[PDB]
Design a binder for this molecule. Structure first.
Ligand SMILES: O=C(Nc1ccccc1)Nc1ccccc1
Ligand SMILES: O=C(Nc1ccccc1)Nc1ccccc1
Lengths: 546, 546
């Protein structure tokens, strides 16, 4: 019974194979067949390439040695190498051209999802080339998806020597018959088979995965489109910044590049961005996924005025100040989406670009009190229920698991009615005590929110709704302004609170506004359609945010 | 009795004045004198410029209005503007050319050091230009040095209206006669004087500072070279990363740009880099100042093997992995300097560039046991004293304030003798119970280290010395390698443990090695000569690390 899968890197998890460039170079340069592949392997176990692979020497120390073996090979074949002939140039573009074999990674990801232990076992080098970062990024993107990465150069052993196989088995704490091993080199597969491991000789991925699925008994080929990579909270880098005495802000941080500040809505978490954090970091950005004031590990002062938009925006500027950031791209959802428009209106020098999911930008009406505006829309009744301090807190805090299970539901899942909430007496009065689990969340993801909400409750969160008049007066000061920095409005077809239609007049105030639209998407945009959100955000970031 | 100083931005804290570009443009373009300065002020309090300054409209909305006022002005003067005439282009290079008036900032910094409340009061705009980040950075660099920044556009008031002055006094919680106010515009100085404030009309800085020093009674002109900006620990962004169960790493984080990982020595802190963190962040880098394993807020496991170089380096790689960083520039001092050379030998793909203060790179000797090598140098006797678990811990932990006061001393300050430590019975046996305070540290900076060392003590720190044989065997595996990535060796003339001479053969293993050398500098390089360290590091980072 198999319980472990081992993958080679070159020609297995990464394509095209760097080994296959020696033959391509021979054909392109009209050199004798195998001249380059022979100079690569010259001296066998005592040769330059083995020393490189065992970590005895670095890639740059090897470059001149390989060059020497190429001349000795050409001397015997009675040939000549081009005068442009450069080993560095050949391996530079070869390593650069090498990309993840996505179907192979998906099969490994599926095997790990089914309880398998996964490992990468590779014959690799210590790369000290000026261009090494490309390969460092590739290794980073791959390794995160596996239980173990065994590199020949770090363990001082190489395939096909049988010590690395015994090292692999000891790392896996597994008997050879419990292990599938995939390699593109027949010779490196031989000792794994001789020990009794299930072995697959990989040429094309499709045949390889058919063999892999037949042996494990798991469907890996033709499987549905998987979800983007999520976050495990304990594996994240956690940041804390004091913005004023007794007010600290928490954030999760991933990646390098321009700063991208993620701002959740009500009643959420930094964790609401779990599907966007790995994807945006991989896309070349420094992600700062906030716990907004009143939530999770951020401070939750009890005073209502601490949650007005002017105070919240000032604190986000101080947050940038304390982190030494002149700007950040601000991406908000729901209440966070509202804050991001106000960051762009009041602090344009600090905002590199602004993006909102579901929340439209609507200028304040100076001729109508915000409470008259709230009454003018029946879907906004729940906001009047939220006004009285302690009333919504008692209902929302009574049973936390029921709260998140009733709220976090997709469009198909008997979504919570928002009409006549005040008349009915509460938000969940016509709701089951034990609601079913939405297709959007696992039981574990629901418990994370339950755990987060145990620290401060719903007072701080509900206080974001208790400054309608304060926010209105502040917003009226910006009525002559236009948003002329890069901006993106993303609408969700089936959000019945923040309807796409509410955003139709935005171009009057944001003339250069760019749009995104998600079909069959409810209010919880990020977890409802993460693949589409990620696609729209990355496309907009690379074109308008840099 | 003065207790507050207020500075204008344009023509006071920042030079050249953006106002003075209208006249320079008139002279360059041969336009009538004051044509541009008149179109700028057209309509006075009801005009475009006032609306911009009150925050009613943004800089980009103002650009076309100013252009219109320029045509109306040229129409009356019976002239014509160039066909290349662009208000955006004029203000773009003007704002860009504007830099901090360093002598003025130094006087403000000195006034704040003498207990004065400092403030910036400026007539400014909401900048939404594509090039706004330049000014955002300038505002960031300046603001950090002041108690308050009052921008006209954020408060909806402008100088010379007397409401902003009454707003200034209320912010300062000060009577007009307790306040010095510096402005380059005579008109904006008038209401501050009329209220009874001490006022200075700034033309050239020198005359202005003579007036400023005569009135406060504080020497601001011809004063000695000040120290670089330091860090206040409570004002920092604090990061935490779990690298394995029960081992978490703490770091302080400041800036944006390429990642620069700072690695302290024994018995130190992230705080040992206090003078480098603001300077490197300002230089265009993302600083990660570590609490190395065993120190401060990082975990301190008790086992000796947890502190061997192989385990420490593996954890630093995991740290990069969890933060989503493919590479970082690694800068180490003392024991941190030793770790950085090993990060470069074993993980070159993860290290963008390597720099060491005082610690030389010396290949392991396979023909001599590390303990024989330690005995071969009398200055290394203290390391043998450090071997026995609990012995150095008891002495180092007995009185913490005495520990840091005896250790942290400059070359001129009766430095602790390192010879015959084992014979004498301890490190401080010939040392006073109450040592004097070194010129390098304040009493408060000593107490920060005392506080940090109260959590875990010296077991974890001393364990870095208890793996001599383990480290030696691991290092012997790298004897065939060369360091061929960017590298910098900084020697300290008066470090009598890590002497400059010990680094002389480095070019045999690091042929492209770059050097730095600090004269009259002891072991505690960073706090002894921070200005010189900062100068050497920034110069090397901008040329070799990017
Ligand atoms: O109240 C919500 N959004 C808010 C965003 C700012 C403007 C006004 C609307 N969402 C709420 C989330 C929980 C229940 C359903 C709607
Ligand atoms: O031991 C020290 N440095 C160490 C760095 C690694 C190689 C061997 C030397 N410094 C020590 C700091 C406190 C007392 C004086 C020296």
């Amino acid at each position: 019974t198999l319980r472990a899968a081992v993958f080679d890197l070159d020609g297995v998890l990464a394509l095209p194979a760097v080994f296959g460039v020696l033959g391509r170079t021979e054909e392109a340069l009209a050199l004798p067949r195998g001249l380059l592949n022979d100079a690569f392997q010259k001296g066998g176990p005592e040769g330059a390439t083995t020393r490189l692979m065992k970590g005895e020497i670095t890639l740059s120390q090897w470059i001149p040695l390989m060059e020497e073996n190429c001349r000795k090979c050409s001397e015997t074949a009675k040939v000549c190498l081009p005068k442009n002939f450069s080993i560095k140039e050949i391996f530079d573009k070869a390593i650069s051209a090498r990309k993840i074999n996505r179907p192979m990674l998906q099969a490994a990801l599926m095997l790990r999802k089914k309880g398998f232990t996964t490992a990468i076992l590779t014959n690799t080098w210590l790369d000290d080339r000026a261009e090494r970062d490309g390969l460092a990024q590739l290794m980073c993107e791959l390794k995160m998806h596996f239980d173990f990465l065994i590199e020949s150069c770090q363990v001082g052993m190489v395939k096909p020597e049988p010590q690395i196989y015994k090292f692999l088995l000891d790392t896996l704490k597994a008997s050879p018959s419990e292990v599938v091993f995939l390699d593109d080199i027949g010779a490196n597969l031989k000792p794994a088979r001789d020990l009794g491991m299930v072995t697959i000789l990989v040429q094309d991925t499709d045949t390889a995965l058919k063999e892999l699925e037949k042996v494990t008994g798991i469907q890996l080929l033709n499987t549905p489109a998987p979800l983007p990579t999520s976050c495990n909270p304990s594996d994240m880098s956690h940041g804390y910044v004091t913005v004023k005495p007794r007010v600290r802000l928490h954030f999760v941080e991933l990646g390098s590049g321009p700063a991208v500040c993620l701002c959740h809505g009500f009643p959420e978490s930094w964790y609401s961005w779990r599907y966007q954090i790995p994807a945006l970091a991989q896309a070349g950005y420094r992600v700062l996924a906030m716990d907004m004031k009143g939530y999770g590990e951020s401070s939750a002062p009890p005073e209502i005025e601490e949650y007005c938009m002017e105070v919240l925006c000032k604190e986000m500027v101080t947050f940038l100040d304390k982190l030494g950031l002149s700007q950040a791209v601000f991406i908000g959802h729901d209440w966070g989406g509202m804050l991001v428009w106000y960051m762009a209106l009041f602090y344009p020098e600090r905002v590199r670009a602004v993006a909102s999911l579901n929340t439209p930008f609507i200028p304040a009406n100076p001729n109508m009190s915000p409470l008259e505006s709230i009454k003018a829309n029946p879907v906004f009744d729940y906001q009047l229920y939220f006004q009285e301090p302690g009333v919504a807190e008692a209902e929302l805090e009574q049973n936390l698991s029921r709260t998140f299970k009733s709220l976090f539901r997709a469009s198909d899942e008997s979504v919570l009615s928002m009409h006549k909430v005040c008349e009915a007496g509460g938000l969940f009065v016509n709701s089951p005590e034990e609601p079913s689990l939405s297709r959007m969340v696992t039981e574990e993801e629901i418990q994370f929110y339950v755990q987060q909400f145990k620290k401060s409750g719903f007072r701080g969160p509900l206080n974001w709704y208790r400054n309608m008049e304060r926010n209105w007066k502040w917003a009226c000061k910006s009525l002559g302004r236009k948003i002329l920095i890069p901006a993106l409005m993303v609408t969700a077809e089936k959000d019945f609170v923040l309807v796409p239609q509410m955003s139709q007049h935005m171009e009057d105030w944001i003339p250069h506004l760019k749009r995104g639209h998600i079909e069959d998407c409810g209010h919880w945009t990020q977890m409802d359609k993460p693949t589409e959100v990620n696609q729209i955000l990355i496309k907009w970031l690379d074109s308008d945010a840099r």
